[PDB]
Amino acid sequence: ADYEPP
Amino acid sequence: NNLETYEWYNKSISRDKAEKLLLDTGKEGAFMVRDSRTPGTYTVSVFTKAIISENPCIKHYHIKETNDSPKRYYVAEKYVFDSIPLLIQYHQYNGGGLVTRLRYPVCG
């Protein structure tokens, strides 16, 4: 949600 | 963690600088990594090099850690390794699922 979810 | 020593793990910078610098470096695979504040590991900031118009598609990921052996970090949902760098190597010398996978370590 706060980091480009792989 | 021998991560901050590689060619992509910065310090106290944050994906901001990574992107701010990665997005400015314009390198088809320019990536970095950093240990956020509430992260259980480290986050990688990658930057590729799109053809034209479309513009570069820089991106970053958080090397998710688990509880196995080795597979200690993963930037996807199956890519788990006990070597973010290796993982990086994996996300560059293998399939990969992130921005054209790792390629060039633009470590600020």
Which residues in B lie closer than 8 A to residue A1 (C-beta atoms)? none
* Position B9, amino acid: Y
Partner-chain contact A3 B77, CB within 8 Å = no
What CATH homologous superfamily does B1-108 map to? SH2 domain (3.30.505.10)
Which residues in A lie closer than 8 A to residue B15 (C-beta atoms)? 3
Which sequence spans correspond to the domains of chain B? 1-108
Which technique? NMR
Residues 1-6 of A with CB under 8 A from B: 3-4, 6
Phi, psi (rounded to 5 degrees) for B20:
-55, -35
Q: Distance (Å) from the C-alpha of residue A1 to the closest C-alpha of chain B?
A: 11
CA–CA distance, B1 with B41 (Å, rounded to integer): 10
Q: What is the dihedral of CA B96, B98, B103, B108, to 10 degrees?
A: -150
H-helix or E-strand containing B33? strand B30-34
Residues 37-56 of B with CB under 8 A from A: 39, 43
